[PDB]
Design a protein around this ligand. Sequence first.
Ligand SMILES: [Mg+2]
Ligand SMILES: [Mg+2]
Lengths: 540, 240, 113, 120
Amino acid sequence: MSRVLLCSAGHSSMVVPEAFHAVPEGFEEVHVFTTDSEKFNPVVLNDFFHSLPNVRFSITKCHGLADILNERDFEFYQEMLWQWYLTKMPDNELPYVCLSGGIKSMSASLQKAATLFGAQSVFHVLADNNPRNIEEMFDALQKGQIHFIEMGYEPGWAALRRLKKILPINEGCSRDNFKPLISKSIEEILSNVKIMASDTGKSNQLPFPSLAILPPIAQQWLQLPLSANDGAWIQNLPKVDLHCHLGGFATNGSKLLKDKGCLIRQVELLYQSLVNDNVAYAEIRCSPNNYADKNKNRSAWVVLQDINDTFTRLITEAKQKNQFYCHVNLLVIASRKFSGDLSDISKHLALAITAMQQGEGVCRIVGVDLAGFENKETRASYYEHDFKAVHRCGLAVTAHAGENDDPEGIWQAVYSLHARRLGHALNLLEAPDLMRTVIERKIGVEMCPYANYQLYPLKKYLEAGILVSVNTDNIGISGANLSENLLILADLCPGISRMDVLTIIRNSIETAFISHDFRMELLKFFDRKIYDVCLISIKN
Amino acid sequence: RLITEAKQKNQFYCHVNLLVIASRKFSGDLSDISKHLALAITAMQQGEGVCRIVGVDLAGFENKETRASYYEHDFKAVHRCGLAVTAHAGENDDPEGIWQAVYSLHARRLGHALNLLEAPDLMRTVIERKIGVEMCPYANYQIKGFAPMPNFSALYPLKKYLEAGILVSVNTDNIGISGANLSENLLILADLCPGISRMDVLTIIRNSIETAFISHDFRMELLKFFDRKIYDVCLISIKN
Amino acid sequence: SVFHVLADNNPRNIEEMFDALQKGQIHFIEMGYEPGWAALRRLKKILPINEGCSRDNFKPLISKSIEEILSNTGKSNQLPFPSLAILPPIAQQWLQLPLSANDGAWIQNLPKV
Amino acid sequence: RLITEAKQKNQFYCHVNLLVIASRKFSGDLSDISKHLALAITAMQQGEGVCRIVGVDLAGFENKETRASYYEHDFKAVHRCGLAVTAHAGENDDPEGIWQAVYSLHARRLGHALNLLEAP
Ligand SMILES: [Mg+2]
Ligand SMILES: [Mg+2]
């Protein structure tokens, strides 16, 4: 924990040691902002802090401004002071600051910086004798002449404290080619507040994925239909992939992947690809029975356990280094056979229940998949009594009735299997009753853009209000990742905009089978990341 | 007519929809249940209107004689039409009853369900399915007893129901009998559930908005109006 | 509007800074328009003029809220009504305060369902 | 390991197989029954080995309130996969519960059933 101290000193440099000694508990880092004037005496605080190496210290100089004389000088000083304050923020803490030093102008500017970004406690210092050398200030504080004065305790604006990611690519804000981007931030916040308070029609709401603090230009840009040149922006956007088959990545499967080494390499390469695509969460459907080998003592349970263990090891390694990581859970696919050994479905269900019973592990089992040939021969009116068992133990179920299926099949897949999530079902338009059912019950749709590619009802699905989630199915077989999956909607569904992409991501994140706590943590991280990425992208 | 005349003057109007109560063993023969649900679905098929019927209700006295696992076969068709069900599975109802109500009847809402805290799997599934739980603070407080009743130890489970993530909704039940409208029904929680914050009250309002059986577009309009009004109220809330 | 006035010579007499403003020596420095909070002035109604008062009757009405701004994850991302973000932070932390009995006026003014 | 060690020295060894008892748990978060059935199914599916799980047993709270005429629908999967069924009932139960147990769960063994003599 770091008690970073920020201050500004004018003709007097004594004030910073007084601020340090005002709280006997002792700070950890101290930084002072000063102009390039010659009246400064850095040596006294320099050797005073050299008396205690254990406390970090730094000095930053505002070049080119001897003193504030006109409007340009003051605006330059304010921009540099804001930049220095925001570049010296703690990563996850509010700092302290003393306003005593400097003339009224920089004191007011520093307090404005505090009011914009927030601080743990702002304070002042009062010296009865106004000491100038260390021994006499020490004697004054020993006697009791030291006086520290405090008013402030403010949280600040999280959103405007959150824009430090844009400081690079400025060379150091040279006056010849300086752009006061902090002034852009302040005009942004004032513009949003004034527009909100000076109108009602615009003041309705708009952004459900939660944000509403971007500049109005940024919101207008979001409202425009997306183009094919937004590839960098969407790639920078974090995504969720709720339908991705493990065995269709390096296209493989039953004939090749029986050995352990191939499974390990497939797992690691899939995780690397997912992290490369900035995907923050995904659900994976895997076939343990298709991957087992009774000859080599390789049971389906063993295969699933090994998958879970390697996934857990990988995510733990990624998290321990404090780098972006992709949380992933497995889905046991109840492969459709309907020809022989029909007990395989029950075996898969029991395996899934026992797998979720593991309990421990950040990576676990959350749902089962009723995939396979979705024809009438294997509709949802066959095994509901057996699915009573999996539903008893509180396990989610994902169905798939989207290819060559009639509305009643979707209907009692919804109402007998009770699929909390639904796959595909592109022809849902022609069943308004089924529209009303799916919308009212808030069950999502696992529509895969490239899979059907190899008029798209996606836009109409968003208009109706279906919680549609864009999914990649098999990136290896399709040859395109999730980023291309959202990219192709530009010409697949004309008139589509970036706000709809954000709503798609939001629908995906609520649609995943996750605990309430993990869901809300994922929402927090996703909101943070989308805010940062749009702030970065709007400027460039 | 009331809604139309209130809106024509561009004032604050409370949009209202109905609920058809299908009581169990309340008047004699149980064919009254089918009469009620047929009436409800036929009223729904009116088509055009402003104040509509959204669904049906299933209410009973205590249990057993008024259990929620008796009329699934009757409920098949009325559910199939497109209505919604709010089973009164609660108030000293055994967990199997609520499980049947949520899963066999596909009921989107529960009445009271005060003792859900002792059925962890029932919690888990309800939270995972975002099934609303209507609950009346003053009514349940009077008829059951929760801290600070004298000579009582049980405390209200609202704060737990919120932090777990249940889509709880605060209601009034019987205004005249309880002698409390929605305002004091929300206010009573301060001494009923200590440590409750205003932010959780806002989330409760949001959940009540979410759990209504209403169309999507009406939901967007309702959310926009509520958010603007809530921002305005909180702007002139800190004044006092 | 809150601003600042700076004088190079810091005049003392009327003719001096009159001449300074004739030349334009006195510059004007402001950090921009400050909306404040749209509604906080009912404190001046509930608290009378109190012309007869001393140090005994201090009002720490807001300072306790200021202290409980951050002194106190669940309450951080539970935000509904996304326009609630634009709400000034002081009122946000006020919402973060626990509920009380005396909020009946706001409860009545609260649009409910 | 015990039976392998006993057999390696060519001594007398007692071959042992398991029975996963599906405890009644009158209410007791009754999903434990399905949990036990799934655990037994996957344990049998493990397969390789000399000591093996061979069947399931249901017992506990023998009173008529927890008879065998409730869970007749769950036992379809455990019977289809290939496991064996045992039902303990008859110490103080009616002479009809045995009929359901033998003819609904297809139980190959009957616990106790001391009062069978009065049901020819
Ligand atoms: Mg697929
Ligand atoms: Mg009632």
